[PDB]
Amino acid sequence: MKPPQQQHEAFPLFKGATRLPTIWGVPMIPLMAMVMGVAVIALTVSIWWWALVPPLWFIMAQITKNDDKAFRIWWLWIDTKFRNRNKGFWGASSYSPANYRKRR
Template sequence: MIPLLLMIIVVAACAMKISLWCWGLVLPFWFVMAQITKTDDKAFRIWGLWFETKFRNRNKGYWGASSYGPADYRKRRFKQ
């Protein structure tokens, strides 16, 4: 449901900025999204997790690789 809403928001923003003809992109985009999720209904969730581990990963310097976890491994400064 979230990717569908995101697609509609992006197409609506393009329609406001560029032209109302951008609303014609809704059906082709919907068809492509349906084809992506035909065999795996969690495909967009997997892409989101890949994005989280590759681009927004703060622990990469600590582990030397991508890891996904709630722990924050920034260097701490201790007061003396």
């Protein structure tokens, strides 16, 4: 059927949605992760390796511009469905209902 529809009276929705706080067009938290990683590489192997910044930084800008919140999804997956140990045994990631906190 046709429940209530629009006739240009619809309440405006502005596209300031998910315009995340970005510097150079990239969010703070993932760019800081890249800074930490490249700093680790620079301190570990060689010091010529702050040239690893612009390539991955540009690829991250292209990723963020297309799909503004990819990194939050990435971190959620990594934290939850990647940590869960017995993925293989169950055929799927499962959490026991009864609270077996290793106590007795």
